[PDB]
Design a protein around this ligand. Sequence first.
Ligand code: SF4
Ligand code: SF4
Ligand code: SF4
Ligand code: SF4
Ligand SMILES: [Zn+2]
Lengths: 190, 79, 78
Amino acid sequence: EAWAWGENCTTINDPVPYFDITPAEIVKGLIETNEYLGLPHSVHIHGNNLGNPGNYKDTLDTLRLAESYKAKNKFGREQVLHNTHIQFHSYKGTSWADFESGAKEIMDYVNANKNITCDIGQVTLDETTTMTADGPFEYHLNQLNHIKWANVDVELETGSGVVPYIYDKNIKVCGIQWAIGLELALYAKD
Amino acid sequence: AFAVHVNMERCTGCNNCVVACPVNALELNTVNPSSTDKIYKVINGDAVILDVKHELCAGCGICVDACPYDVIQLSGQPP
Amino acid sequence: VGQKKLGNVNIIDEDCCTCRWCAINCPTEAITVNKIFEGEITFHAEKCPGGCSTCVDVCPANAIYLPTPKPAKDMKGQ
Ligand code: SF4
Ligand code: SF4
Ligand code: SF4
Ligand code: SF4
Ligand SMILES: [Zn+2]
């Protein structure tokens, strides 16, 4: 929503423009709502600071938001929130020249906690278009690679962004991105 | 309490005289609305002034300035 | 040599309306205007139906303003 004005919430704590609610508060409120209604699927969560180096710290910060809930429903599920494409959230380091993998730390936290389930976003190393409902990531990607960019802001609801991208084999960045998902999947005890 | 006259012959139903009137905008856009009566409503494609007895207008000129193809004449003299 | 003051500045008295704009903004406090009327005027902003800047357009002394909307990352919930 801050993208609707042109900004982005770069962490878990900063407030939304004019609403003064934070990512942490909204995630917690939606978790309480979900587990109270007993919906089948948990709060599927994207996350913040997507696609930037060093955001494994923020990924742990956002995963620590479930430490006080229990999945109550008539359906069998042990999650309380589902953290998605985590190979995107498991980066490390300062920039793209000092960039390595934080999958070890992410999966240590997940192997600890039993109310957190994940999935990997393994990159298949080819040409693709990247579509996420958040604007700022797609805009940042467009400013990186200078290719097409489409933005679709919805009214009182979400954002959007479509940007082609080349995950080619001839880049250190893309190679490490490929390695990260495999590290995540191969560090899973459960 | 003035009198507004709408030239039905060139009214297109644009509804920018209804949206822009500040007496129409009193109901939904005010805290604790005072009066909920409306000067214009576009019935059958042309702007109809429900303010028959000339009690609610205030000669603001927001509606004359709003109509894209001038069609609203505002009378500042007693009807 | 001291001071220059080429010409004179003075107020047409049948046109001035005691606004205090030039007195309030004069650099050397050399203008003496006193308002003809005294009292108080209050604006209940929560009752203005928005796009009606007739008051702004007709105020002689341009006392009225439309308070400028704040930017994002500065609205602070107000
Ligand atoms: S002059 Fe002002 S108050 Fe009267 S009908 Fe037009 S917009 Fe409404
Ligand atoms: S703004 Fe003008 S053209 Fe549009 S409905 Fe009113 S009178 Fe007709
Ligand atoms: S600024 Fe005020 S005092 Fe000066 S001429 Fe204008 S109305 Fe009169
Ligand atoms: S002229 Fe000013 S005070 Fe009067 S209704 Fe319009 S916005 Fe409100
Ligand atoms: Zn996503």
